[PDB]
Structure formats: structure tokens, C-alpha cells
Design a protein around this ligand. Sequence first.
Ligand SMILES: Nc1nc(O)c2cc(CN(C=O)c3ccc(C(=O)N[C@@H](CCC(=O)O)C(=O)O)cc3)ccc2n1
Length: 308
Amino acid sequence: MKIAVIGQSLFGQEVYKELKNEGHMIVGVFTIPDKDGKVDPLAIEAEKDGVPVFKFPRWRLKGKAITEVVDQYKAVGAELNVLPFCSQFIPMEVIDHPKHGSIIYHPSLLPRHRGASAINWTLIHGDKKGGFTVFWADDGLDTGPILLQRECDVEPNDNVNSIYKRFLFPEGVKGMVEAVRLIATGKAPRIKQPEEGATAECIQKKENSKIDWNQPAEAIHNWIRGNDRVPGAWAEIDGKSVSFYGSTLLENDHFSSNGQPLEIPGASRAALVTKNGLVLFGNDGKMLLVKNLQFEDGKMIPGSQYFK
Ligand SMILES: Nc1nc(O)c2cc(CN(C=O)c3ccc(C(=O)N[C@@H](CCC(=O)O)C(=O)O)cc3)ccc2n1
């Protein structure tokens, strides 16, 4: 069928590539402008194929969509919009245009974790299960009827990158391709999202990924892994903003109080720099271990190396 792909990143590129390989006519790719150095992976693959690339800035403003952004979109004659990873909200004029409407990839088990940082919040809340949903776009934020959903176990030490790479990305691509196949064969469903279990959270950025030390250790571990790698959980240490990556919970033994103490303002008590990383304490007397640290405009350093 005729498809407009609206989105970005490696994920949008892989979905584009698979749909093209399945015989679909990609009539247009609508993506972010270069930054301004690198061209987005999706525009690169599209032009390599001879497919109309668009780099619109934003569609909405003053409560409204333009006509110059709408009209260039409508020209390509899409029968379905596919929104693999779309960094912004798209006007209903665009969303409702094609005969089949629009489908969106969302890396959570909707109606849980509506919002743009769903993977982060899945881990921050310490959910045992996670996954993704392909849903039909409506005017609300991640509220549209479900086409399909796929589920996975969240591992205790999963960070954003590991669950994404293990499951959300590769299976998300297959889910998007399957959704289109169900649509093309005329069998795709529209399951209204249940009321029960709905949540929505804010988008995670550097500023609001600051660590709140007054929480039990498990909560701090979840907060850290839930913001690892991006935006990167952080705290003030000795005047510097320091980011924390690679958290695990640390049980036994003592332990080991053989590190060099490291004072962290607001921490329930001083941290310990050990050969295996930075031991941190929650407000419940329990411990977590952080493998890697990072300063502003700096490389990753092992927590074990803080004092050298
Ligand atoms: N009509 C419609 N409906 C949805 O549910 C959409 C979901 C998504 C995917 N998404 C899931 O949370 C999402 C991603 C980003 C945004 C967003 O508002 N992004 C801006 C913030 C505001 C803006 O500039 O638009 C940004 O780049 O940070 C909203 C929703 C994308 C487009 C959608 N369009």
C-alpha cells in the first residue's frame, strides 16, 4: 500500500526499510532537520532509495497547523501514516487524511505510561513487565485504540538501553511491520484502551533526572537505571554535576567499608569508592553499586577510579 513514514532515528529507518522490503510504496518520509551536522538515519536511507524526503521544522504553533506543512504532506497521497518514533505531536488534519488513518509505535503497555519517556518510567517505577503497543492515532496523547501489543520481562538490572536493544527495538520493528500487514489484509483490530491502569508521566530531561537521595536503595537503583543512558541520572558532588550509570543492588556482606568515603550532599550517608564501583546508600540503610560516573564535558570513568 502507499505509506508516509513520519519519525526518525535508527528505529524509523529500520521500519522504513522493512516496509519497503515488503513491497509497500513509501510515498514520503517526514523527519527532523539535520542537527545541523548529521542527517537523520531515516532521510539518508530514503534518499538513497529515491523517496521524497521532508525536513519540516514543526507543524503546530498558535494552537494550529499550517497549510504549507499540511499541503506538502497531502500531496504524496499516503494511504497509511506510520509513526515509528515521532519526536513531536502531529495535527489531526495530517493524522486523519489517509484512508487508513495513522498508526503509532509506543514503547509501553498502554494504557500504562502514556508520554514520551515511557521506557524511562517503566524502569523508574520498577515494573516487572514492559513492552510496546501499536495503536491508532487519535487527538489525545497516546490514548488511541490498540492494534497490537507485545510484552516482555523487565530484568532487575535493565537500563533504558538494554531493554530497548534486547526487545523494544527489534520486536518493535516486527510489530510495526505486522500491524501494516494486518491493515493491508483488512483484518487489523481497534481495541479501545481500558480505563483501568492508565497512567501518564512527564518527559525525562537532564534537569528533572536529578537524583532524589531520600528514597530507599531500590528506588534509587530504579531511578538510575531508568535514566541510563539518557538523560542520565545525576547529583552534585564537590561542586560538580556528576552522572551515574550502571546500577545494581548490593546485598552482602557488610560491605565492605573498605572503600574511601565520598561525601555527597543530601545523601543519607557518605558513599564508598570501592574496587568494584561507587557504593551508595538509600534512606533505608540498604546499598546499591554504581559502575560508571561522568562529569559535564567528560568521558565515562569507572566509579572505582573517582580518586585517581
Ligand atoms: N495526534 C497524535 N497523537 C498521539 O498520541 C501521538 C503520539 C506520538 C508519540 N509520543 C508518545 O508519547 C509523543 C512524542 C512526543 C510528543 C511531544 O509533544 N514532543 C515535543 C514536545 C512538544 C512539541 O514541541 O511538540 C518534543 O519534541 O519534546 C508527544 C507525544 C507522536 C505523535 C502523536 N500524534
